[PDB]
């Protein structure tokens, strides 16, 4: 199957600037002077929409600031300038041979200035503890850019494989993200330790921030 390496996964663009989205195919998708690479746009809760077919042929009604280019194994979708309605996910798709395959997607995100997260930690409720599980929640609020490392430490032991992160879409007013990191332990494991700490590293912070509490 023809694998499509679409880069990047997430692409910051300032409004007004150029967005350049690449798609490499693992072999050629050319035949008889046609390059069979198609591009789509998808917004949350909506179907994809065809933008470009045969590499460079913009579908009728699609604005001129969209252009497709490339051949053989390397293809490009450029958006210049990026208008606020253009922020969405984009996919490349080869129509050379079955099975039809898609790239992994490129989300255009609004570039804005760096904003450090506000960090908060929440013990599990006494109510949840009654049921037999303990969820410890670390909140990073209103930050940019998206990339941030959240480490959990439990009596100074670094935690591995018992936490899950979830991130909101960019806020419509300020273009920041928020993120939750949730550490899930049994009531048993929770009770064995005292100090619970969430360490956050983000480029907006000069040094990492730790929020912690003692069980009590």
């Amino acid at each position: 199957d023809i694998v499509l390496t679409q880069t990047p996964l997430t692409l910051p663009v300032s409004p007004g600037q150029r967005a350049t989205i690449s798609c490499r195919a693992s072999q050629s998708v050319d035949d008889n002077g046609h390059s069979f690479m198609n591009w789509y746009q998808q917004k949350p809760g909506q179907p994809p929409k065809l933008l470009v077919h045969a590499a460079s042929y913009v579908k009728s009604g699609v604005p001129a600031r969209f252009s497709g280019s490339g051949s053989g194994t390397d293809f490009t979708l450029t958006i210049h300038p990026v208008e606020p309605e253009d922020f969405a996910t984009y996919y490349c798709q080869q129509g050379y041979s079955h099975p039809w395959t898609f790239g992994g997607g490129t989300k255009l995100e609004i570039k804005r200035t760096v904003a450090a997260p506000s960090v908060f930690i929440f013990p599990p409720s006494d109510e949840q503890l009654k049921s037999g599980t303990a969820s410890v929640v670390c909140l990073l609020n209103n930050f940019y850019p998206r990339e941030a490392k959240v480490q959990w430490k439990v009596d100074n032991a670094l935690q591995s494989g018992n936490s899950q992160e979830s991130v909101t879409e960019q806020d419509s007013k300020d273009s920041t993200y928020s993120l939750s990191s949730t550490l899930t332990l049994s009531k048993a494991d929770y009770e064995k330790h005292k100090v619970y700490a969430c360490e956050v590293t983000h480029q907006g912070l000069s040094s990492p921030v730790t929020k912690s509490f003692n069980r009590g």
Binding site: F36, P48, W100, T182
Partner: protein, 218 residues
Amino acid sequence: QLQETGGGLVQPGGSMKISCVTSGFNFSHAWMSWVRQSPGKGLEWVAEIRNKSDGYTTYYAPSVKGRFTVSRDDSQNMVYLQMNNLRAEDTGIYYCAQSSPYSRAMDYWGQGTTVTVSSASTKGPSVFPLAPSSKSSGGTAALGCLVKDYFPEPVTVSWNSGALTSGVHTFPAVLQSSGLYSLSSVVTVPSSSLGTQTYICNVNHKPSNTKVDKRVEP
């Protein structure tokens, strides 16, 4: 122009048939495809059926061939997907689309129907408080609700029956290894409000037809 139906809940090993009604173009001439989207596996092509002139030739993604069957009925402008021996990996939004003979692009997609494949029984969430911390720097406190162990998606969360919207962040669900979903909803409020203002999250879960209101205090 295109509209899918038939999606819902089913257990691994089970079967489901979905359909797609179309209009606004010559259906009998068109090639039609199914494509599915699993949150965090992007778009995956599933099946194709053509005709235009001859064959009703069918093509399948390797990982569903034999299990899945695409058919059509030209007289009703209907495409069908019969899915047997379903696995959790098949969970997704399934879209029907018109495949172009030129570029093999997919030209006009429906809104999609979701197929969810799991052993989990439908269950409303347990809702726990994320209590504001005592003390503190700028006079803002964050608080929230942990909405845990429900199936299937989705839940909706509001605050104080829709009267509190500024600074609310409701995170996307994560599917836990139990097969149940979990998320949190948070909001930031003035520290000075915490004695005088009550803060309640309203969690609605349509598939269980349940509504849970939880007060979150110090």
